[PDB]
Amino acid sequence: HMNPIVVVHGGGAGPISKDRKERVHQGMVRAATVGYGILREGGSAVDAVEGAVVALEDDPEFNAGCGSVLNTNGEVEMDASIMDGKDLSAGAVSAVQCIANPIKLARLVMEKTPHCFLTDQGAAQFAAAMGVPEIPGEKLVTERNKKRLEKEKGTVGAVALDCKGNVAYATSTGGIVNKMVGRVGDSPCLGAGGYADNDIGAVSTAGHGESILKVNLARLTLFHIEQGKTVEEAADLSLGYMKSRVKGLGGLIVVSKTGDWVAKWTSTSMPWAAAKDGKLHFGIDPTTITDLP
Amino acid sequence: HMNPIVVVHGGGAGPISKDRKERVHQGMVRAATVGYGILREGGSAVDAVEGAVVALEDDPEFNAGCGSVLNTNGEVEMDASIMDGKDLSAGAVSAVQCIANPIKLARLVMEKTPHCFLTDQGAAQFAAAMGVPEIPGEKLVTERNKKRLEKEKLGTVGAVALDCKGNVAYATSTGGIVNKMVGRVGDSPCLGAGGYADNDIGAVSTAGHGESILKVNLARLTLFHIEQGKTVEEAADLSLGYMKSRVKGLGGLIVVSKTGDWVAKWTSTSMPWAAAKDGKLHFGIDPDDTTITDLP
Ligand code: NA
Ligand code: NA
Ligand code: NA
Ligand code: NA
């Protein structure tokens, strides 16, 4: 049976402060530890990517759940998706509010409806049927995010391969700062924000949402592998095309069916981390290979 | 410069009794002929697919705009998207209510905003801001679909086009499926799934079970194949082939390559479709019941 792997990513975004890397690092390391621990007891791929995306949602440092950017009204609106590479089962929520873990809600859509995607008010309806807690907007808005906005006036993801050779992906975000109300970016859109398939691999993406959607980056990446490119070569084709075709920047993380993995990005910085073989590989900048504490 | 062409379709579901067949064939002819009228008259492939689908939305016999299927909670929530192959420029909307024409809001999303996709409350407010009229919910509603939602206690409309300047586009629009959960979103607004447009390959607009079409990203898979060497019909067959086996989904698509070539195919029992090219109307519902007239 396969040796399991988890890869995580924060945003494929701008350059970070020298002091705050410390802080961002430990965010990647932590969510990846939650993912690799899960695989380390025969959790499934969906378990790992969800608990890993769960970690970063909870973390007010990352642009997802608590920590989400604000829309044009000072308000957090959230998208996410999760996908099962064996049978292509999937779940996604878009433009949801007053909840803590949009990724946990995306799994609930997937596991307990015959639908794959719920939006806005029907998505709240679904959450409360599932007895998901309402929290105050305040509890998701950093003092920080209000400043990022008023000047103008991040994504998190995970891929894993488990003990049985299943792949999966999770991606969650608060979107782009100042976005129109009800703007949906790539995150809850299969093939854009992520894709996962046992006959190929899994991908979660980050960066400019409209650009990712337009070139179908996640599924695109995996086409290149399907043609026998390396996971390195594949991700260099998709992001390079995204740049030359739509002037969009981003980054991505991928695991192929046989367990090869990479983080590549064309933006300034894509914070990432990976666990495989009791060893952890951490970076923010264009990499520590280190024991699993 | 190329010979312009539009292809239009309706839902990809089951058997259709002869009495409904006629108005459906009727409406598909208005759609093909409206879109073509724009292409003949110098217009863009984006303009032209916007054309074919507004006719399909305003026409009651098709699950998009007027005559959209009802969600579990007796309301209309509509999905639409539109793409320009020129630059891959796109606009989209999900869970829109109480407007006549979702595809127009979608194009307004491609042109008037920095985004490609708005939904529900957000999409309603942009529609206020662009001067989209706020039309009472019940006029979208129809007895056929009232009967149907009652009995439950499915349709999509689309077009692709090639223009006389070489450019390609698709538009897709839907009400979803019968007794869907509130705020359910299917394939029809998701680029790569409910449709894909790329001047360097061609354009495709899908029909059928939204959830499957999303799982396999049906429209972009037909294109990958057309890139690889496959003819439009082989690519149709194979992508359509894979949704059936891998995820046990049925549906359809229309496609039109950057070379002039077009096809319409389905794995559902039926799919109302018409193409217009070189001064003729093509149409059909069930496999090779092909009839061609001359289009004035
Ligand atoms: Na967070
Ligand atoms: Na990002
Ligand atoms: Na209609
Ligand atoms: Na349909």
Swiss-Prot record, chain B:
The modification N-acetylmethionine is found at M2. Substrate binds at R184, V185, G186, D187, A207, G208, H209, G210. It is an enzyme of class 3 (hydrolase). Keywords: Acetylation, Autocatalytic cleavage, Cytoplasm, Hydrolase, Protease. The keyword Mitochondrion does not apply. Induction: By 5-alpha-di-hydrotestosterone and progesterone. Cleaved into an alpha and beta chain by autocatalysis; this activates the enzyme. The N-terminal residue of the beta subunit is responsible for the nucleophile hydrolase activity. One of its GO terms (molecular function) is asparaginase activity. Has both L-asparaginase and beta-aspartyl peptidase activity. May be involved in the production of L-aspartate, which can act as an excitatory neurotransmitter in some brain regions. Is highly active with L-Asp beta-methyl ester. Besides, has catalytic activity toward beta-aspartyl dipeptides and their methyl esters, including beta-L-Asp-L-Phe, beta-L-Asp-L-Phe methyl ester (aspartame), beta-L-Asp-L-Ala, beta-L-Asp-L-Leu and beta-L-Asp-L-Lys. Does not have aspartylglucosaminidase activity and is inactive toward GlcNAc-L-Asn. Likewise, has no activity toward glutamine. It catalyses: L-asparagine + H2O = L-aspartate + NH4(+); Cleavage of a beta-linked Asp residue from the N-terminus of a polypeptide. InterPro entries: ASRGL1_meta (IPR033844), Ntn_hydrolases_N (IPR029055), Peptidase_T2 (IPR000246). This is Isoaspartyl peptidase/L-asparaginase. Glycine accelerates autocleavage into an alpha and beta chain. The active site is at T156 (nucleophile). The lineage of its organism: Eukaryota, Metazoa, Chordata, Craniata, Vertebrata. Heterodimer of an alpha and beta chain produced by autocleavage. This heterodimer may then dimerize in turn, giving rise to a heterotetramer. It comes from the Eukaryota. Its EC number is 3.4.19.5, 3.5.1.1. GO terms for biological process: asparagine catabolic process via L-aspartate; proteolysis.
